[PDB]
Amino acid sequence: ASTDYWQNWTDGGGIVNAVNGSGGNYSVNWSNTGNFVVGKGWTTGSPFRTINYNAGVWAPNGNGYLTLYGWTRSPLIEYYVVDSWGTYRPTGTYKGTVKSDGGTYDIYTTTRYNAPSIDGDRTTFTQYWSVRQSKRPTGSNATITFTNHVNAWKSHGMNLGSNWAYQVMATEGYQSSGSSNVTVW
């Protein structure tokens, strides 16, 4: 599918050279950053979407995530399906596991306090996570069947909001450096 949304947010720290390439391709070179999120996807997320991607380059030199990323409003929730990471594997309050697309993912919840949200400014909100137990190899055509995650989350009382915001396959970094090149469809 054609992506219709380009996500390029940075808190302003360090260097984030994000390139909006042809079709669903994008690349990022980052150095000594604060927090940033770059990716391509869709303006309106869907719990039924099957996301395809191929990360031709996944080279974080520190804390960085290769992850499906999105938000819902009512309530405000930032969600993640993490396929790979750098030096730090994100974890939180353990809820259970879900097997999807050839991998096993741990399910976690965390809460952010007085942090920037999709609406700008700062607030407190919950984050839902599916984090692969081992890093998914990159360079291949990968699939994330999002419905499997939504359903597993629902079974543990993790319900998404009713107003869907963007949904992208992203590169997120925190006080690190690295490079990524990803194609989404």
Swiss-Prot record:
It holds the Pfam family Glyco_hydro_11. PROSITE patterns: GH11_1, GH11_2, GH11_3. Keywords: Carbohydrate metabolism, Glycosidase, Hydrolase, Polysaccharide degradation, Signal, Xylan degradation. Its EC number is 3.2.1.8. Pathway: Glycan degradation; xylan degradation. It comes from the Bacteria. PANTHER family: ENDO-1,4-BETA-XYLANASE A-RELATED (PTHR46828:SF2). This is Endo-1,4-beta-xylanase. It comes from Niallia circulans.
